[PDB]
Every structure is written in C-alpha cells, then in structure tokens.
C-alpha cells in the first residue's frame, strides 16, 4: 500500500542479502528472498533499495518469528545514491522493519535514522520513526 | 422509460447469434454473413438479460 511513487534509487540489496532489524518486534536480522515490483531478466538478481517492500525471513531472533516468510521495508541503505537535488548520500548499514502487506508495522518503535524517501512512501514508518535522515 | 428502453433494445438485444462464429446477426436472418463459417444456417437467438 504505497502512498505515492518514488524516484529511482540505486539498488544495493540483491536477493540473499542480510540486513539489520530496525524495529522492536524481537527479530535481529532480515534475510531477503524477493523484492516486490521487480522486473524479469535472465540471470539478473532481484534487488531492493530504500523504501522498497521485500519478502524476508528472520534468521536470528524470537523463535516465533523464525522459519516463515513475512513482508519487510528497507529503511537504511549503505549503497550510495543520488537525490534529485544533486547530493550523493549513504548510511552506515542496511536496516529494515517487519510489516504486513498493507504497510502496517508489526513493531511500534524504530531505532536509528530513517531515509526521507521511505518515510514519505510509508506513513506508518514515518509515525514510528524518530529522526528522518 | 419503456419507450426509450424499447428503442435501445432493438439495437442491442433483438439480435441473432451464429452458433459457429458468435457473429451478431439480424433477428430474422436465416444464414450467417461471415465467410469463416461458410454462411452456415445454424443460428440461435441472443439471450435476454435475466
């Protein structure tokens, strides 16, 4: 349930990447298995960027969240990308938050900064985020 | 609007249908005008709305 569109951002999280869990749902990391809205090309790995919704599995954390597939939203990206104002920027790590298909967050708090692109696209992430960029 | 509904019915509802190519045909037609089915004479009325 994206609330608008998003200008293209450099992809840095292909399938198989592991990112930190930025919420308090009890999970510690997220293992990306798919990207929503990705295209098709032979041998090309689906990849995600800031603000994308992915399908992920929890590898470390509460056992009730393990061994299952759940949606997730990327909120920080270590790969540098260029904004339309001419600025190249990047974060120190890759992080995500567990969400349902409608975009509602499973947790209730977010630790660390959140990208501006993600906050605008997902209103629920913006509500639980403390500092944007 | 029975008068206006009847007027629109003769163009949209009162038709025949070819059983081989689904072509829309006049209600009094005996053969289909299409060459794909060989001008077959197997026709059925167009089904009415409920």
């Amino acid at each position: 349930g994206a609330q608008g569109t998003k200008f293209r951002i450099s992809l840095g999280l292909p399938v198989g990447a592991i990112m930190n869990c930025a919420d308090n749902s009890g999970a510690r990391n997220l293992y990306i298995i798919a990207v929503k809205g990705s295209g098709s090309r032979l041998n090309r790995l689906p990849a995600a960027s800031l603000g994308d919704m992915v399908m992920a599995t929890v590898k470390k954390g509460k056992p009730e969240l393990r061994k299952k597939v759940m949606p997730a939203i990327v909120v920080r990206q270590a790969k540098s990308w260029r904004r339309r104002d001419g600025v190249f920027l990047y974060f120190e790590d890759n992080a995500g938050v567990i969400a349902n298909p409608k975009g509602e967050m499973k947790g209730s708090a977010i630790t660390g900064p959140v990208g501006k692109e993600c906050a605008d696209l997902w209103p629920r992430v913006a509500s639980n985020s403390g500092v944007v960029v | 609007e029975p008068s206006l509904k009847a007027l629109a019915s003769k163009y949209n509802c009162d038709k025949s249908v070819c059983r081989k190519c689904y072509a829309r045909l006049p209600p009094r037609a005996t053969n289909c005008r299409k060459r794909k089915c060989g001008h077959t004479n197997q026709l059925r009325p167009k089904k009415k709305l409920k």
């Binding site: - | 609007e1 206006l4 509904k5 007027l7 629109a8 019915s9 163009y11 949209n12 509802c13 009415k48 709305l49």
Partner: protein, 188 residues
Amino acid sequence: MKYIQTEQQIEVPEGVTVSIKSRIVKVVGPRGTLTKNLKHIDVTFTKVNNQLIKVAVHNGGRKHVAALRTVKSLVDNMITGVTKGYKYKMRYVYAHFPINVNIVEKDGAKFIEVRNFLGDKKIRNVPVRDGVTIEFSTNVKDEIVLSGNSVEDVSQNAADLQQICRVRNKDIRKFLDGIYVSHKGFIT
C-alpha cells in the same frame, strides 16, 4: 441464365430535371442539386419523355441483373432528396448520467460534441458532413434532428453519432445508454 433484356422504370416529377451522360447522373430540383457517378455497373439509360426514364441491362446474369434494381433505387432517392428531402431523428437514452450534446466550431469545421457519456471525462467529437444541418427539437426532451438532401450523407452522419457512444467492457443488455436513430422520414 443470361436474360435477354431486363427493364426498370424511373419516374420524374414536374419540377425536377435529370441529365445523364456517360453514366454521370445530375438531378436538379427545388431543394438543390445532386450528382452521382455510376461508371461501375454497365447499364443503359434511355429517355421516354420528360416524366419517365428507363434503365436496362442486356444479356445479363443473375448477379448483373440484381444491380439493375439498385440503380433505380439510388436514382429515385436522389429525385426525392431534391424534392422532399430527408429528416432523421435520434433520441438520447441514459440511466444515470445525463448526456450533453452541443454544436461547436473548431477551425471552421462545425463539429458536434458529446459530454458526460456514462460519466466519462473524455470529449467525443463527430464531424458534420456538408449539406447536413443539425437542430435540437423543441417540446421533445433529448432529441436531435438531422436534415439534408442526400440520404446517404444524412444516414452516415447519424450512424457516426450512434457508433461514437458504444459501451465498452460492460453488459450492453444492462447498460442501454447511447444515441439511437428513432425515425426516418422526409423534411416535408
């Protein structure tokens, strides 16, 4: 079976003059003049008097003879077109969204616009052919009248208006909305 001779008769009123030469037909009447090119049928026109004209086919098959009666009908339609004219009436049919029809001018082309067809935001434009006049009848709700001397010009102009208002991706038996020809007659 190659009939030896097949004949048809064409009647002419008092005020109408007909000039035929090399299968070119011009009909002049009180309401104007019409011209038709018929150099694709191979018929022979002959004049009996000022009130009767005959057209015949010699040594013609079933298919060739069938076109002889068509020639008579086309010439007869021209004769009454310049004497009585043709008048086609259409009615607006809709369930919920009213249909707004108005005449507009675009670079001197005399178009006619249809607005709010099934709530569509798109504007539908239909050109108005030469010799065809469009009026909106009084004391009858949602009626448009097309008049002219040529029956083909009036009929095709009305047909274009009907096809421009066809429903897509819906059950046409339920969504009976559009503009349909309701009466065919003469101006007089």
